[PDB]
C-alpha cells in the first residue's frame, strides 16, 4: 500500500524523569507551503529544536547546546533532518493522508428537542470540523437568544456541537435547525412545529 | 504557527523509572495510530485507516530505543533533576444525545497530565466492563491529555482520576 514514514529521533552521546520527541509538519494550501519543526523535550521543558525556517538545530535551553552543536556538525544527520520535510511531511500528506485523513467525510446527525423555554439542536458525529448551524423561526434567521457550545472533540475522529435557542412556543410556529457542512450536498434542515 | 493542517508525526515519549513508552501519530489533533510496544503491533484508531494505509511498527521500536537512550543521558546531564508533577482536570460529557433505553457512550476528558501515568476509573462502585482509554495526546505546553470512554445504558456516574500531582483522587460526577 502507501505508508506512513516517521522522523528519526536524533540520538545524543520516587523521582521520575520524562523525555518526549515530536515532528510537526505545518501544511498551508496542501503542500504549497510546508514548515517542519522537530522538538526534543526533557521534563516538560523543551530544550532542543530544529525548525526548517532556521534550517539548522538550535538550543532552546542551555541543556541543548551540546546536542544542537553536535547534530549541526555531522552532515549525515543535519542533511537528513532537513530532508525530512519531504521524506516525512510532503510524503505523508501526499501519500497516506490523501487516502485517509483528507478523504474522510462523515455527516452529522441533527435532532431538535425542547429542554419561555429553549430548544436544543444536537449536531453530532461529523468530520471535518467545518460546520455552520443557524436557527430559523417561521423562516426568519434567529440570531438573538441563540448560543452554541464550542466545537467538542470526541476523540474518535468525530465532532459535535449543540446550539440552544431561547424561545417561547406558540401553537403554530415552526422552528428549523439549519446545518451546512462539507459532507452534505444540500444543507440539512430539521423542523420542530410548535 | 498558522497552517491549514498539522500532522504530528513520530511522537515518542519515554519515562523512567518504570520503562514506560509511547509512540503515536496524529493528524489535525486526532490520533492516527499508536505502536503497541509489547505486541509490537501498529494499532489504528479507526480500523478503516489500517485498511487504507500502513506503518511498520519497527520504526516505532527503534525510535523508542533512541528516546530511552536520550533519556538516560539527559537524566544525568542536569545532575538528575526530577519531574515536577501537575494537577489534572477532568470533564465528562456524552458522545450522542442521551436517551434512556438507548445505548450511549460517555466520555471523560482529562487534561494537564504530566508525567503521563494516571489511573482513570469510574453507582458508588467501580466498573470495568466496556471502557476504552485513548493514548496520551500532546498539548502545546508539553503536558498531555487523555480520554476514557464508558458505554452506558442511560438510566435513572462519576469519573475518578488518581494521579501524583493530586493529593487525594478527584471524582467528577455526572
Amino acid at each position: 500500500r502507501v505508508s506512513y514514514y516517521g522522523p528519526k529521533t536524533s540520538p545524543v552521546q520516587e523521582r521520575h524523569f520524562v523525555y518526549q520527541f515530536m515532528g510537526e509538519c505545518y501544511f498551508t494550501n496542501g503542500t504549497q507551503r510546508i514548515r517542519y519543526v522537530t522538538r526534543y523535550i526533557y521534563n516538560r521543558e523543551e530544550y532542543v529544536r530544529y525548525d526548517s525556517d532556521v534550517g539548522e538545530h538550535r538550543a532552546v535551553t542551555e541543556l541543548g547546546r551540546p546536542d544542537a552543536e553536535y547534530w549541526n556538525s555531522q552532515p549525515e544527520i543535519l542533511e537528513r533532518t532537513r530532508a525530512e520535510l519531504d521524506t516525512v511531511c510532503r510524503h505523508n500528506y501526499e501519500g497516506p493522508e490523501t487516502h485517509t485523513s483528507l478523504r474522510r467525510l462523515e455527516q452529522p446527525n441533527v435532532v431538535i428537542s425542547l429542554s419561555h423555554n429553549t430548544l436544543v439542536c444536537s449536531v453530532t458525529d461529523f468530520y471535518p470540523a467545518k460546520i455552520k448551524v443557524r436557527w430559523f423561526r417561521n423562516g426568519q434567521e434567529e440570531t438573538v437568544g441563540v448560543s452554541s457550545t464550542q466545537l467538542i472533540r470526541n476523540g474518535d475522529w468525530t465532532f459535535q456541537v449543540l446550539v440552544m435557542l431561547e424561545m417561547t412556543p406558540r401553537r403554530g410556529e415552526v422552528y428549523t435547525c439549519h446545518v451546512e457542512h462539507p459532507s452534505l450536498k444540500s444543507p440539512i434542515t430539521v423542523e420542530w412545529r410548535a | 504557527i498558522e497552517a491549514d493542517h498539522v500532522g504530528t508525526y513520530g511522537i515518542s515519549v519515554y519515562q523512567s523509572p518504570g520503562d514506560i513508552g509511547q509512540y503515536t501519530f496524529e493528524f489535525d489533533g486526532d490520533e492516527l495510530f499508536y505502536v503497541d510496544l509489547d505486541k509490537k503491533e501498529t494499532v489504528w484508531m479507526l480500523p478503516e485507516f489500517g485498511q487504507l494505509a500502513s506503518f511498520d511498527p519497527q520504526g516505532g521500536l527503534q525510535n523508542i530505543a533512541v528516546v530511552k537512550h536520550n533519556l538516560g543521558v539527559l537524566t544525568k546531564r542536569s545532575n538528575s533533576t526530577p519531574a515536577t508533577n501537575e494537577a489534572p482536570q477532568a470533564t465528562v460529557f456524552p458522545k450522542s444525545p442521551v436517551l434512556l433505553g438507548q445505548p450511549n457512550t460517555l466520555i471523560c476528558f482529562v487534561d494537564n497530565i504530566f508525567p503521563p501515568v494516571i489511573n482513570i476509573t469510574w453507582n458508588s462502585k467501580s466498573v470495568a466492563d466496556g471502557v476504552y482509554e485513548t493514548s496520551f495526546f500532546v498539548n502545546r505546553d508539553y503536558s498531555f491529555h487523555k480520554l476514557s470512554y464508558l458505554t452506558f445504558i442511560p438510566s435513572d456516574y462519576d469519573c475518578k482520576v488518581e494521579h501524583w500531582g493530586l493529593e487525594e483522587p478527584v471524582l467528577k460526577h455526572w
Partner: T-cell receptor
Amino acid sequence: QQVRQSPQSLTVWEGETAILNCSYENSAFDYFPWYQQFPGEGPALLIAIRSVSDKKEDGRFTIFFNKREKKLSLHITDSQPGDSATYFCAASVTGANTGKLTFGHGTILRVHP
Amino acid sequence: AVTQSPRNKVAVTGGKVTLSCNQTNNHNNMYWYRQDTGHGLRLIHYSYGAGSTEKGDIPDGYKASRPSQENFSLILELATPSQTSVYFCASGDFWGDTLYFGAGTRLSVLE
C-alpha cells in the same frame, strides 16, 4: 522486495573489469550497500549508493544505479586477484526506520592471476 | 570490535547450543544472521537495545537474548540438523549506514 543478483559465479583474469549485477522489486528501496566477504571472515561494507544518486565512485569500484529499471551494477576495474570474494547486494527502505537490510544471495568472484 | 564465541562447535540433535556475541563500538543495534549456500544471509533475531529483541525473517528454532548493550546471544534449545550453518553477528548505530560483522562461527548438528 526480494533482491536478485547475477551471475552466481564470475571468473575473471587479472586486469579485466568485473560486472556484478543486482535488481530489486520493491520500489521503496532507496539505499543500496554492497558488502564484500573474504573466505573465512564475515562481510564488510564495500561501497554504497543512495537512490537520489546516479553513480558512486571509489577507487577501482563503482556502483551504477538505474531507478527506472530498478537495476544496479558494481564494476571492478583492474581486477586484482585479491578481489576474489563473495559480493552481496543489499537494500533498505530507509524511511521505514526499521534497521533491517535485505540481502542478495551474493556472487562469487574468483580473479585469476 | 565485534567478536563471537565459540568459533566452531559440534553438537548433536536435541542438545542446547548457545552462540554469544560481544561488541565494543557502543553500538545500539545487534543482529544474528545465518549463511547457507542457496540462501544468502538470513536474519534470525536482532535487538535495538538491552531487554528488547525482535524476530527476524527466520526466527523459528532459536531464541535470542540481549542482556547488555554490548551483548547479544543466540540460543538453540533443541538443536536440529537443519540448523547446521555458519552464523554471523553484527552491530550498528542508530540509523546506521553500515553493518559490522563478526568473523563467524561454523556449527554442525549431527544425528
